[PDB]
Structure 1
Amino acid sequence: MQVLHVCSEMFPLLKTGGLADVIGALPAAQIADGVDARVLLPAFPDIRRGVTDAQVVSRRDTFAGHITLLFGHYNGVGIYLIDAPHLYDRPGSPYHDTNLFAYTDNVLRFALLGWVGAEMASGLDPFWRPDVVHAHDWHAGLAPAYLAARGRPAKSVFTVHNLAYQGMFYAHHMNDIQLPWSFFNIHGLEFNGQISFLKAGLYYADHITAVSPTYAREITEPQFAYGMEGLLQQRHREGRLSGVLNGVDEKIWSPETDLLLASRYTRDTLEDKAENKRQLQIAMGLKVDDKVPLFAVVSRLTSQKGLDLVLEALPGLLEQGGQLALLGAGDPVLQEGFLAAAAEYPGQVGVQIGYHEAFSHRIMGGADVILVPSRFEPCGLTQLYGLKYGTLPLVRRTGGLADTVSDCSLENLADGVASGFVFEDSNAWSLLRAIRRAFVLWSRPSLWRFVQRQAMAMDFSWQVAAKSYRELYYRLK
């Protein structure tokens, strides 16, 4: 069984969110579970420089211009790179220019990603051809459409990591992407009078997967599907929609082995976590104090994540005696609101605006609680990292957060299953009840520790996820 993943990012070479983490760990896990998994990425500069043994496989002309298909290895996995300097050799984000504007040739940049995933099924590589083409998110959304246009020489799965990003392009671009004009239909890739790369992946894929069991159900609702629900409801009924939870990459996210930490520690030696906390307090400019709970955020700053609610609730949090440490970048309203909060409460609120990979480990390894108050959350990896690091997650019951965190209620405590704090509604009062829950658990240090050790007993394994993907791939054949 040979599978090609088609995607736009991969940790540690290029990452803007959780997707990169998945693509960096899932394939190696699949190989260990008996599937021959390879990855296809655009040759963005950080990607191209990371794959140092890449060799030429072929050259082709394309509706988007010429490509050199390269193949090398990263961390023992086979990586194909689409080297097309005129599309992909640009600094910064893979998705937008330095002024945060989507590149105007994005339609071609990402149509080509999908076209190459499909062509791989037709022998683009003389020495290897996938049985299944596994496309991830809108960027890779056209891979199943090109496959359909060609008579489906391989099967396809489409995984939605996030249904809010739809890859909308004007309809006239049907002229530019070499697909049958007849694909521009409601039963096809048309969505609200435009081309949608997400609609295309959802429509043409043999099977659709979401990145948690509950998100898979949620996207059959208008509230989470934003117009795709009728399509997703139909695929559910046909048995062509399922949820497979993400794992965590233990080589990177384990406090037991984490070289990025002041002090490593385990489920049975959590006293060794305290130094991380002390150093994090110093680093953020917070008061150095082990008697006080340290709440943290590590997160993209968009409305998805419900962080305006954190701002609203912050005075309540401070009033009860907690600190906040935030790392994140995105919406300038959020950036400026949190900077202002940091300026307003020196020693209580510490804030760093930007993307900082190493610093996120130091937060995760030093904080007491991780706040993930999402409006929607396909999976959420930060809360999985908190569990593993014994930093109790405080989450809204939605998406993968609903699948992974167990509230500190009476039954869950008694059953020894409690691992974090959960609130229901997207408003600051509801968030604030869970925060108070946290302060109450905090005043009972031996209950807090009991909850920490259960959080750290939870396991989210990529080789277990791969078993599920593998069953799917074989069912498809």
Structure 2
Amino acid sequence: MNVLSVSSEIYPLIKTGGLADVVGALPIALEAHGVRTRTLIPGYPAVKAAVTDPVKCFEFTDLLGEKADLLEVQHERLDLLILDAPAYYERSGGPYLGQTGKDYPDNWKRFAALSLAAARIGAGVLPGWRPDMVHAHDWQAAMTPVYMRYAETPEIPSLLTIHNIAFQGQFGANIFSKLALPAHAFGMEGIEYYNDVSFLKGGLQTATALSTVSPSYAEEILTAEFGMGLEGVIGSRAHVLHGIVNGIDADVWNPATDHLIHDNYSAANLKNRALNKKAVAEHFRIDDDGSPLFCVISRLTWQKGIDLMAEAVDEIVSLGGRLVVLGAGDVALEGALLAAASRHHGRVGVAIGYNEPLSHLMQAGCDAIIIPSRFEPCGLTQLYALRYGCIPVVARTGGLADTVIDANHAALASKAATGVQFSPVTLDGLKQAIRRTVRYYHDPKLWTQMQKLGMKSDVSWEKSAGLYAALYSQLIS
């Protein structure tokens, strides 16, 4: 099957957030499932520069009143379809922000044009290649299903994935007459959102199927706490809402080969793991012993529950454990953390900033990682931890609730548990989770078993991509 992906960004060409990571990894992974994907991305200056040997394969005479060439190029396993619309994308500034740091007043027309071109490509406008379906990503591309719906030619199936529910492509209804859409399209059934225009809302309304980055997150955005005002809409289409967990690069993240850790190991052979634990303590300048070593590797914010992690350090230390923290954020949280490091000198080590190699070493040498998030559409940290044999201790929120098998009586009895989850997401819940982890740690037969199992979890992109394929094939009937 041939799929047309649609996004305003893609790794490694352009990136402002995790959006590009998924859009850049899925297509490659999907090749393993027999799915050819061509990704339509804007001809950003940085895009045309990066790529090699581009081929003009089409020209749109009128794209909301603008000329555009369509270059097709293969870039590092990525089969791309670049949209060269100098009037929209030749700006020299972020893809969305001006040289001044703010949104282009043009944004609405810039991505509407990107969606419209995609809609036409989906309509068979390109001789030689026609998609069986389209997969749009986020608000920049959510208008693709809208233009297909209102186009004369019947729509082909569309899937819209929400990565960023907080960015809804909301604009004044005063741009409506410049969108090349029928008047009735400005309605409930269409793109009107409280007398304003909302692109995301439009696509949520028109797409054949909707998705996001975890089953649990798909449940959450149906509630007011996560829907960002869109829960009413999505809820009316819940019967076509899907949640699919993100994968990771399990070739790069493989403890058996990772070059950014002290010593390599595998589920089959863990002895070597302890050498990484030593190195982690040495690096953080803390005691090096056989006691539980917890880590945190995250942005220090209320969103990530690090407010709860600060009131929970004493509980760790009090239990005989250690804690090492790598991450940056809320200066009040940094401080309270830094302060914990002095009050519990030798037992708690904090490191503020960014450090990817250390991040690989911490996954390889710490015993457990605390991820007390209140918000986590999917999450990567717990997936790396499983892979690496670091037991995740996570809040039951979004992706975290979907990817860890909690060590409850039943799971331990069938030896199916891979980690510790807690809910609700409170300090009490957190201290409880922690205590449990330490109790588990002091039962080595149980602990190592949890590790070996977590380490055999398929957290690869291919696995994730296989779930998209099933859906694709299902949408394509």
Residue of structure 1 in register with 2:379 after alignment: 380
| Range that drifts further, 387-396 or 170-179 | 170-179
CA distance in 1, matches of 2:33, 2:461: 10
Match of 2:120, SS state, is helix
Residue of structure 1 in register with 2:420 after alignment: 421
- The Cα of 1:263 is off from its aligned counterpart by 2.9
Give, as a single letter, the amino acid of the residue that structure 2 aligns with 1:185: G
Instruction: Deviation per CA, 1:274-297: give whole Å up to 9, x if none.
Output: 3444444444x3415243444333
Residue of structure 1 in register with 2:363 after alignment: 364
CA distance in 2, matches of 1:303, 1:67: 44
Q: TM-score, normalised by structure 1?
A: 0.87
1:220-299 aligned within 5 A: 220-236=222-238, 239-283=239-283, 285-287=284-286, 289-299=288-298
- The Cα of 1:434 is off from its aligned counterpart by 1.0
Residue of structure 2 in register with 1:444 after alignment: 443
Instruction: Deviation per CA, 1:171-226: give whole Å up to 9, x if none.
Output: 22324443334322232222233222221221110111232233333333333323
| Range that drifts further, 285-294 or 206-215 | 285-294
Give, as a single letter, the amino acid of the residue that structure 2 aligns with 1:105: D
Q: Is the 8 A contact 1:18 1:381 kept in 2?
A: no
Residue of structure 2 in register with 1:460 after alignment: 459
- The Cα of 1:240 is off from its aligned counterpart by 2.2
| Range that drifts further, 181-190 or 390-399 | 181-190
Residue of structure 2 in register with 1:23 after alignment: 23
Match of 1:116, SS state, is helix
CA distance in 1, matches of 2:364, 2:100: 33
Match of 1:448, SS state, is helix
CA distance in 1, matches of 2:188, 2:65: 25
1:267-416 aligned within 5 A: 267-283=267-283, 285-287=284-286, 289-300=288-299, 303-320=302-319, 321-328=321-328, 334-339=330-335, 341-342=337-338, 345=341, 348-354=348-354, 357-416=356-415
Match of 1:52, SS state, is coil
Report whether the alignment pairs 1:170 with 2:172.
Answer: yes
The RMSD of aligned alpha carbons is 3.0
Match of 2:117, SS state, is helix
Q: TM-score, normalised by structure 2?
A: 0.87
Match of 1:305, SS state, is coil
Change (3 A) 1:253 1:93: farther
Change (3 A) 1:98 1:373: farther
Give, as a single letter, the amino acid of the residue that structure 2 aligns with 1:232: I
Q: Is the 8 A contact 1:339 1:351 kept in 2?
A: no
Identity %: 41
Instruction: Deviation per CA, 1:403-458: give whole Å up to 9, x if none.
Output: 21112222211211111111101222212211222222233344322211111122
Instruction: Deviation per CA, 1:57-101: give whole Å up to 9, x if none.
Output: 334353374444322223323122234456445677544468864
CA distance in 2, matches of 1:418, 1:16: 36
Q: Is the 8 A contact 2:393 2:419 kept in 1?
A: yes
Give, as a single letter, the amino acid of the residue that structure 1 aligns with 2:223: E
CA distance in 2, matches of 1:471, 1:174: 36
Q: Structure 1 regions of 5+ residues with no counterpart? A: none
Residue of structure 2 in register with 1:2 after alignment: 2
Report whether the alignment pairs 1:71 with 2:72.
Answer: yes
Instruction: Deviation per CA, 1:89-125: give whole Å up to 9, x if none.
Output: 5677544468864444332333333223223213454
